[PDB]
Amino acid sequence: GTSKLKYVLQDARFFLIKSNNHENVSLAKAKGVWSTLPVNEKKLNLAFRSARSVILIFSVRESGKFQGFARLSSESHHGGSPIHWVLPSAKMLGGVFKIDWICRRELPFTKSAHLTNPWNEHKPVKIGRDGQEIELECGTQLCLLFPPDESIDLYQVIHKM
Template sequence: MVVSAIAPPKATRIPESFFILKSLTSQDLDASVRRGQWTTQEHNEAGLNAAFERAENVYLVFSANKSGEYFGYARMLAPISGDLGAATSPVTSSDVSPDDGPRSIPTPATATAPSGRIIDDSARGTIFWEADDVAEDEDSPLKEQATNDLSAEQELGRPFRIEWISTGRLPFFRTRGLRNAWNANREVKIARDGTELEPVVGRKLMLLFHGVGF
C-alpha cells in the first residue's frame, strides 16, 4: 500500500502589524516620500523583519521629532536586507583620532522639557539628546516631550522599500484616548522609535489619517 505524504499546513499569517517610527527631521521624511524607502535604527530591524514574515501588511506610522504630530503612514514592501556599509558609510577606527570621542553637554530644564544632555559624537556621525529621569505620570508634558526626544539617537541600519499611503498630518491631540495595550496601556503618542501597536488600536490610528473617528 502506498501512503502519500501529507504536506504540513502553512503557518497562518495575521492580517496586519503596526509600528511607530520616528525621524529627527521632517526633511528626512520628505526625502523618504520621494525615494520610496526608509532607513531605521539597527535595533528595530529584527522586529520589523519578523512582522513582515508573519503579517500580510506591515504599516509604519511616522512622526518627526518635536513636531507634535504624525507625518503620515506607509506600508513595508520588502524585508530589510542589503549592504549595511552602502547604507550608512560608517567611520572606521582609522578615521577617528583619540581626541574625537563623544562629548556630553548638559542642558537645563525648561518649561517644556526636562533637564538632560546632548551627546555629541560627530566624528562617528551621531548626535542625540537624552533626558534625565522625569516623572512617571504618563500625562505629564515633560514625559511626552522627553519621549519624543529620546528617539533622536541614530545608529542607522539598511534601507528598505516602503509605499507611502498618506502624508496627511495628524496632530497628537486628535489621538487622545487611543491607548496601546502593548506599551503599558499608554496613549499612542507616548512611544519610542520602533514601538509596536496593538492591532485594533493601530487600525483606529490609521483611520484617523482619513478622517474616520472612533
C-alpha cells in the first residue's frame, strides 16, 4: 500500500541530491548516511528543523535515473566513523546526516517527464543542481512514481516524525 508513504510525505520538504558516482549512493544505502558541501549542509539543517519530514531524492549523474529517496533522521554531525566517499578533498565536505531509506528502487527519468519543479523555472524535475529544492506537489508526485520497496517498513519512520 501507499498510505503510510503518503503520511510520511505529508507536508514534507524535498531536495534533489546529485551524486557523481554510484559508489557514493551504494555507501549511503548501506550505512544510512549522507554528506554534502557546506552550502547545502546549511540548507538541509535549516529544513530539518522546519518540517515534519525532509526527503532527499538521489540521482547519479549521467545515469538517466533516480536511485531512490530517504528521509533525514538527524542534522549534520562531525566526529563520526569516517566514510570512504569517492571524491571526484574530504575536508571540503560538511557533517554527516543520518538518513532512513524510504525507497531503494530506481526510477528512470522517462517516467518523470510530466513533472516540473516551480522552484527551478518549471524545468523537468530531473533537472537541477545538487541541493535544489523540489516544491511540495512535484516532490510528492515524484516519490509516488517510484516502484514500491516492499523491503521497507515505514512504521519505524513514522515514529520519528
